[PDB]
Protein backbone atom coordinates (compact mmCIF):
# COMPACT_ATOMS: atom_id res chain seq x y z
CA UNK A 1 0.00 0.00 0.00
CA UNK A 2 0.83 3.71 -0.21
CA UNK A 3 3.17 4.68 2.62
CA UNK A 4 2.71 8.09 4.25
CA UNK A 5 5.65 9.51 2.33
CA UNK A 6 4.07 8.41 -0.95
CA UNK A 7 0.71 9.96 -0.08
CA UNK A 8 2.74 13.08 0.75
CA UNK A 9 4.54 12.95 -2.60
CA UNK A 10 1.25 12.68 -4.50
CA UNK A 11 -0.22 15.55 -2.49
CA UNK A 12 2.79 17.75 -3.26
CA UNK A 13 2.76 17.02 -7.00
CA UNK A 14 -1.00 17.51 -7.29
CA UNK A 15 -0.70 20.96 -5.68
CA UNK A 16 2.37 21.86 -7.72
CA UNK A 17 0.50 21.03 -10.91
CA UNK A 18 -2.57 23.03 -9.84
CA UNK A 19 -0.31 26.03 -9.23
CA UNK A 20 1.37 25.81 -12.64
CA UNK A 21 -1.46 24.83 -14.98
CA UNK A 22 -4.35 27.29 -15.25
CA UNK A 23 -7.21 25.45 -17.01
CA UNK A 24 -8.88 28.77 -17.84
CA UNK A 25 -5.88 29.73 -19.96
CA UNK A 26 -6.51 33.37 -19.11
CA UNK A 27 -2.85 34.29 -19.70
CA UNK A 28 -3.02 33.32 -23.37
CA UNK A 29 -4.26 36.83 -24.09
CA UNK A 30 -0.88 38.32 -23.14
CA UNK A 31 0.78 36.37 -25.97
CA UNK A 32 1.41 37.89 -29.37
CA UNK A 33 -1.87 37.19 -31.24
CA UNK A 34 -2.35 34.01 -33.30
CA UNK A 35 -2.52 34.41 -37.09
CA UNK A 36 -4.49 31.81 -39.06
CA UNK A 37 3.92 31.33 -43.84
CA UNK A 38 4.84 30.58 -40.22
CA UNK A 39 2.07 32.96 -39.23
CA UNK A 40 1.64 31.09 -35.94
CA UNK A 41 5.31 31.28 -34.92
CA UNK A 42 4.98 34.44 -32.79
CA UNK A 43 1.98 33.10 -30.87
CA UNK A 44 3.24 29.57 -30.33
CA UNK A 45 6.72 30.84 -29.50
CA UNK A 46 5.20 32.91 -26.70
CA UNK A 47 2.97 30.03 -25.64
CA UNK A 48 5.95 27.68 -25.55
CA UNK A 49 8.12 30.22 -23.68
CA UNK A 50 5.31 30.63 -21.14
CA UNK A 51 5.03 26.86 -20.83
CA UNK A 52 8.75 26.58 -20.19
CA UNK A 53 8.35 28.92 -17.20
CA UNK A 54 5.43 26.83 -15.92
CA UNK A 55 7.31 23.54 -16.28
CA UNK A 56 10.22 25.02 -14.30
CA UNK A 57 7.80 26.05 -11.56
CA UNK A 58 6.50 22.48 -11.42
CA UNK A 59 9.96 20.95 -11.46
CA UNK A 60 11.20 22.97 -8.47
CA UNK A 61 8.38 21.54 -6.38
CA UNK A 62 9.31 17.92 -7.17
CA UNK A 63 10.39 16.29 -3.88
CA UNK A 64 14.17 16.08 -4.12
CA UNK A 65 14.68 18.13 -7.29
CA UNK A 66 16.12 20.98 -5.21
CA UNK A 67 18.70 18.71 -3.58
CA UNK A 68 20.24 18.47 -7.05
CA UNK A 69 23.03 20.82 -8.15
CA UNK A 70 22.36 23.94 -10.20
CA UNK A 71 23.99 22.40 -13.27
CA UNK A 72 21.96 19.21 -12.96
CA UNK A 73 18.66 21.06 -12.55
CA UNK A 74 19.53 22.99 -15.71
CA UNK A 75 20.43 19.89 -17.70
CA UNK A 76 17.26 18.06 -16.64
CA UNK A 77 15.04 21.02 -17.53
CA UNK A 78 16.55 21.80 -20.92
CA UNK A 79 16.23 18.18 -22.00
CA UNK A 80 12.71 17.58 -20.61
CA UNK A 81 10.95 20.91 -21.26
CA UNK A 82 9.54 20.01 -24.67
CA UNK A 83 8.53 16.56 -23.42
CA UNK A 84 6.68 17.87 -20.35
CA UNK A 85 5.00 20.50 -22.52
CA UNK A 86 3.75 17.75 -24.85
CA UNK A 87 2.70 15.64 -21.87
CA UNK A 88 0.94 18.46 -19.98
CA UNK A 89 -0.81 19.48 -23.21
CA UNK A 90 -2.71 16.18 -23.14
CA UNK A 91 -4.98 17.94 -20.63
CA UNK A 92 -6.20 20.32 -23.35
CA UNK A 93 -6.09 17.74 -26.16
CA UNK A 94 -9.43 16.34 -27.37
CA UNK A 95 -10.00 13.25 -29.52
CA UNK A 96 -13.14 14.78 -31.03
CA UNK A 97 -11.20 16.61 -33.71
CA UNK A 98 -7.60 15.77 -32.76
CA UNK A 99 -6.89 19.25 -31.46
CA UNK A 100 -5.94 21.14 -28.33
CA UNK A 101 -8.87 23.15 -26.95
CA UNK A 102 -7.65 25.99 -24.73
CA UNK A 103 -10.93 27.80 -24.08
CA UNK A 104 -11.71 29.77 -27.25
CA UNK A 105 -11.45 29.50 -31.04
CA UNK A 106 -8.46 31.86 -31.09
CA UNK A 107 -6.84 29.54 -28.57
CA UNK A 108 -7.70 26.18 -30.10
CA UNK A 109 -4.84 24.57 -31.97
CA UNK A 110 -4.75 21.91 -34.70
CA UNK A 111 -2.29 20.24 -37.08
CA UNK A 112 -2.51 23.29 -39.33
CA UNK A 113 -1.59 25.72 -36.57
CA UNK A 114 1.46 23.67 -35.59
CA UNK A 115 2.62 23.46 -39.20
CA UNK A 116 2.06 27.23 -39.40
CA UNK A 117 4.78 27.40 -36.75
CA UNK A 118 7.22 25.75 -39.14
CA UNK A 119 6.87 22.08 -38.21
CA UNK A 120 6.10 19.20 -40.58
CA UNK A 121 4.11 15.99 -40.30
CA UNK A 122 7.32 14.16 -39.46
CA UNK A 123 6.76 15.59 -35.97
CA UNK A 124 3.05 16.41 -35.90
CA UNK A 125 1.91 12.99 -37.10
CA UNK A 126 3.63 11.11 -34.27
CA UNK A 127 2.67 13.92 -31.85
CA UNK A 128 -1.05 13.39 -32.50
CA UNK A 129 -0.68 9.61 -32.20
CA UNK A 130 1.07 10.20 -28.87
CA UNK A 131 -1.72 12.44 -27.57
CA UNK A 132 -4.28 9.84 -28.62
CA UNK A 133 -2.47 6.96 -26.92
CA UNK A 134 -1.87 8.92 -23.73
CA UNK A 135 -5.50 10.07 -23.78
CA UNK A 136 -6.70 6.47 -24.17
CA UNK A 137 -4.94 5.65 -20.91
CA UNK A 138 -7.41 7.82 -18.97
CA UNK A 139 -4.82 8.58 -16.30
CA UNK A 140 -5.89 9.73 -12.86
CA UNK A 141 -4.52 13.23 -12.29
CA UNK A 142 -2.24 11.55 -9.71
CA UNK A 143 -0.68 9.40 -12.42
CA UNK A 144 -0.46 12.40 -14.75
CA UNK A 145 1.64 14.50 -12.34
CA UNK A 146 3.81 11.55 -11.31
CA UNK A 147 4.53 10.88 -15.00
CA UNK A 148 5.61 14.47 -15.61
CA UNK A 149 7.83 14.48 -12.51
CA UNK A 150 9.41 11.15 -13.53
CA UNK A 151 9.99 12.58 -17.02
CA UNK A 152 11.88 15.56 -15.58
CA UNK A 153 14.05 13.52 -13.17
CA UNK A 154 15.58 11.14 -15.73
CA UNK A 155 19.12 9.82 -14.94
CA UNK A 156 20.10 9.25 -18.57
CA UNK A 157 19.80 12.84 -19.76
CA UNK A 158 23.10 13.73 -21.44
CA UNK A 159 25.31 15.91 -19.27
CA UNK A 160 24.02 14.59 -15.96
CA UNK A 161 26.68 14.76 -13.26
CA UNK A 162 25.17 13.11 -10.19
CA UNK A 163 23.16 10.53 -12.13
CA UNK A 164 23.08 8.34 -9.03
CA UNK A 165 21.16 10.98 -7.08
CA UNK A 166 18.90 11.63 -10.07
CA UNK A 167 17.98 7.94 -10.22
CA UNK A 168 17.33 7.91 -6.49
CA UNK A 169 14.90 10.80 -6.82
CA UNK A 170 13.22 9.21 -9.84
CA UNK A 171 12.94 5.77 -8.17
CA UNK A 172 11.09 7.30 -5.24
CA UNK A 173 8.58 8.71 -7.74
CA UNK A 174 8.46 5.49 -9.80
CA UNK A 175 7.74 3.37 -6.72
CA UNK A 176 5.10 5.88 -5.71
CA UNK A 177 3.48 5.52 -9.13
CA UNK A 178 3.69 1.71 -9.27
CA UNK A 179 2.17 1.45 -5.80
CA UNK A 180 -0.55 4.02 -6.57
CA UNK A 181 -1.65 2.09 -9.65
CA UNK A 182 -1.99 -1.09 -7.59
CA UNK A 183 -3.73 0.58 -4.64
CA UNK A 184 -5.87 3.18 -6.38
CA UNK A 185 -6.28 2.26 -10.05
CA UNK A 186 -8.97 -0.40 -10.58
CA UNK A 187 -8.84 -3.09 -13.29
CA UNK A 188 -9.09 -3.35 -16.25
CA UNK A 189 -7.94 0.25 -16.69
CA UNK A 190 -4.86 -0.70 -14.65
CA UNK A 191 -3.80 -3.54 -16.94
CA UNK A 192 -0.09 -2.98 -17.66
CA UNK A 193 -0.67 0.71 -16.99
CA UNK A 194 2.82 1.35 -15.58
CA UNK A 195 4.52 -0.33 -18.52
CA UNK A 196 2.32 1.66 -20.88
CA UNK A 197 3.06 4.92 -19.07
CA UNK A 198 6.79 4.21 -19.25
CA UNK A 199 6.42 3.48 -22.95
CA UNK A 200 5.00 6.99 -23.32
CA UNK A 201 8.28 8.29 -21.89
CA UNK A 202 10.11 6.40 -24.65
CA UNK A 203 7.79 7.89 -27.27
CA UNK A 204 8.62 11.34 -25.84
CA UNK A 205 12.36 10.80 -26.46
CA UNK A 206 11.82 10.33 -30.21
CA UNK A 207 9.41 13.29 -30.30
CA UNK A 208 12.01 15.33 -28.42
CA UNK A 209 14.60 14.28 -31.02
CA UNK A 210 12.43 15.17 -34.02
CA UNK A 211 11.40 18.49 -32.44
CA UNK A 212 15.04 19.40 -31.79
CA UNK A 213 16.04 18.59 -35.37
CA UNK A 214 13.27 20.77 -36.74
CA UNK A 215 13.94 23.48 -34.13
CA UNK A 216 17.61 23.76 -35.11
CA UNK A 217 16.53 23.94 -38.73
CA UNK A 218 13.95 26.67 -38.14
CA UNK A 219 15.99 28.76 -35.68
CA UNK A 220 19.08 28.56 -37.89
CA UNK A 221 17.27 31.11 -40.05
CA UNK A 222 17.79 34.58 -38.41
CA UNK A 223 14.35 35.84 -39.43
CA UNK A 224 12.72 32.97 -37.51
CA UNK A 225 15.10 33.17 -34.55
CA UNK A 226 14.05 36.82 -34.37
CA UNK A 227 10.42 35.73 -33.75
CA UNK A 228 11.34 33.59 -30.72
CA UNK A 229 11.89 34.69 -27.13
CA UNK A 230 15.02 34.96 -25.00
CA UNK A 231 13.88 32.09 -22.77
CA UNK A 232 13.09 29.80 -25.70
CA UNK A 233 16.46 30.68 -27.23
CA UNK A 234 18.34 29.96 -24.00
CA UNK A 235 16.50 26.74 -23.19
CA UNK A 236 15.94 25.19 -26.63
CA UNK A 237 19.21 26.48 -28.05
CA UNK A 238 20.63 29.54 -29.81
CA UNK A 239 22.28 28.75 -33.16
Amino acid sequence: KLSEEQQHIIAILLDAHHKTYDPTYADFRDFRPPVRPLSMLPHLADLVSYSIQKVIGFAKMIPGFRDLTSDDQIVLLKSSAIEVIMLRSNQSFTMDDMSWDCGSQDYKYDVTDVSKAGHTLELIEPLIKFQVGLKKLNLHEEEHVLLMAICIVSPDRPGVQDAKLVEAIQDRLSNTLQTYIRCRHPPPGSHQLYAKMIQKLADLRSLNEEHSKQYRSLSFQPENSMKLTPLVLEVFGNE
Binding site: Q53, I56, L77, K78, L231, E234
Partner: peptide, 10 residues
Protein backbone atom coordinates in the same frame (compact mmCIF):
# COMPACT_ATOMS: atom_id res chain seq x y z
CA UNK B 1 25.59 30.62 -19.33
CA UNK B 2 21.85 30.11 -18.64
CA UNK B 3 20.90 33.39 -16.85
CA UNK B 4 17.12 33.25 -17.20
CA UNK B 5 16.79 29.55 -16.40
CA UNK B 6 19.14 30.06 -13.45
CA UNK B 7 17.05 32.98 -12.19
CA UNK B 8 13.84 30.98 -12.61
CA UNK B 9 15.34 27.99 -10.79
CA UNK B 10 16.53 29.75 -7.66
Amino acid sequence: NHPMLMNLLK
